[PDB]
Structures are given as C-alpha cells and as structure tokens.
Amino acid sequence: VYADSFVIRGNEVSQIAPGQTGNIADYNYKLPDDFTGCVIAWNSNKLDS
Amino acid sequence: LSRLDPPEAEVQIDRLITGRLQSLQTYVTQQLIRAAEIRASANLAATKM
C-alpha cells in the first residue's frame, strides 16, 4: 500500500483519475494510465475554510 | 493517440487490434485453403506429367 494525500477544491476532484488532463492532473499530481487503487475525498470546510 | 488521452484510447486501440486481427485470421485461413487446393492440383499435374 502506498497512500497519498492532498487538499483541493470540490469540483476539482474530477481531475483525480487515470490519464486525465487539467491543472491538477498535469502540473500538480498525475495518476498513471494503468493506476490501480482507490481515490477518496471529503468535505473539509470546517477545517480548511 | 493525439485526440484522446492515454487510458481512453486503449479500449479504442484494443478494439482496433481485435478488428485488424480478425481480418487477418480469416485471410490466413483462406490462404491455407487455397494452398491446399494448389497442392492437390500440383500433385495431379505431377502425376499426369
């Protein structure tokens, strides 16, 4: 198991998937096209807002 | 490989490879049938000679 973590917008989580393109997908964090695993996200306004 | 992104081009590449292999398998089968026919004709021609 390797586990990664980070903070992003709500709609921006759409970019977290294999082979995607975008600001996060291209210039901050990119998943390999053959990535296997799970992507997990949740609201964090109570903390990060 | 230029319009679509790596992991959504794969099912497309997979389908293209399947279609191009199914068109070659039948070609090889027809070639084998025609080669068997030519071999029978050549055996008959050699017997006649």
UniProtKB/Swiss-Prot annotation, chain B:
Lineage: superkingdom: Viruses
General function of this protein: Subunit of the fusion protein that is processed upon entry into the host cell. Mediates fusion of the virion and cellular membranes by functioning as a class I viral fusion protein. Contains a viral fusion peptide that is unmasked after S2 cleavage. This cleavage can occur at the cell membrane by host TMPRSS2 or during endocytosis by host CSTL. In either case, this triggers an extensive and irreversible conformational change that leads to fusion of the viral envelope with the cellular cytoplasmic membrane, releasing viral genomic RNA into the host cell cytoplasm.
Protein name as it appears in the record: Spike protein S2'
Organism: Severe acute respiratory syndrome coronavirus 2 (2019-nCoV)
Taxonomic lineage: Viruses, Riboviria, Orthornavirae, Pisuviricota, Pisoniviricetes
Gene from which this protein is expressed: S
